[PDB]
Nucleic acid binder design. Structure first.
Ligand code: MG
Lengths: 92, 95, 91
RNA sequence: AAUCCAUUGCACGGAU
RNA sequence: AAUCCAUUGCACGGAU
RNA sequence: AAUCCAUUGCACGGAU
């Protein structure tokens, strides 16, 4: 989805990277754009190669996506959209 | 030839998912690109040489420039948009 | 590196393109983002398929990276990062 | 309309 | 853990 | 010069 959101959806991630390293790496890269509330990574069948970065502010999310769109990350260009719906911690 | 990087009122988008029909492509493109400025037109055609392609015409060059810097590589119907500036002025702009 | 720098690092370049045409073609793409101080290309084994574009202003390098990330050059998407270290002409 | 073949194309095609 | 196979997936797998 | 093999490499090769 193209509708600005607090959360960015990243896919095409290198699946060899384990959750802890991926979370640390995504936080170091994306922290620059503003305060990150959380990064949700899962390694199960439907969730690998994927991350949700939840920014406190939409303006940080918009800036992260526009700057990091296509950035080569562990040999794969990041594909970044806005999450299709609000992440739970944002919804409350 | 190289990607065209000389700012222009019009951005040229290729590598569009060709399964998307004209009406929906224009409607989706408007929804995405209207956040960068006022859009005068969006030219889509589904002929052989025109498929996979759109011209989005902004009233001001500054909007084209923001649109290109922002939406480059956006995953749009599972294919990253490829954006340049239009080689030459659109007719709407020329008059 | 993901940190803005005066210098952009490009790889996944079509190794068939020769130095002069690669350098001329990179100026024609990237010069439109602001003044380029230098474009460094070598075709030696460790250096081929790569270029460093040194901009005068960091805003120019940032606009160039964001705007041309993944854009096909001689049938290959350009992979653009910021240089890990300042180019010598900058330092 | 749909499925398939082909098309990465800078403007103001073919098959069932 | 690792290795191989499969998976491009919008959330709060299989084999040694 | 051309072509083949190898190389995805963060700087200031082999081969006909
Ligand atoms: Mg078809």
């Amino acid at each position: 989805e193209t509708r600005p959101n607090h959360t960015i959806y990243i896919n095409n991630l290198n699946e060899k990277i384990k959750k802890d390293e991926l979370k640390k790496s995504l936080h170091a890269i994306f922290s620059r754009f503003g305060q990150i509330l959380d990064i949700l990574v899962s390694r199960s069948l439907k969730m690998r190669g994927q991350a949700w970065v939840i920014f406190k502010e939409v303006s940080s999310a918009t800036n992260a996506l526009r700057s990091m769109q296509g950035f080569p990350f562990y040999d794969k260009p990041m594909r970044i959209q806005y999450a299709k719906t609000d992440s739970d911690i944002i919804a409350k």
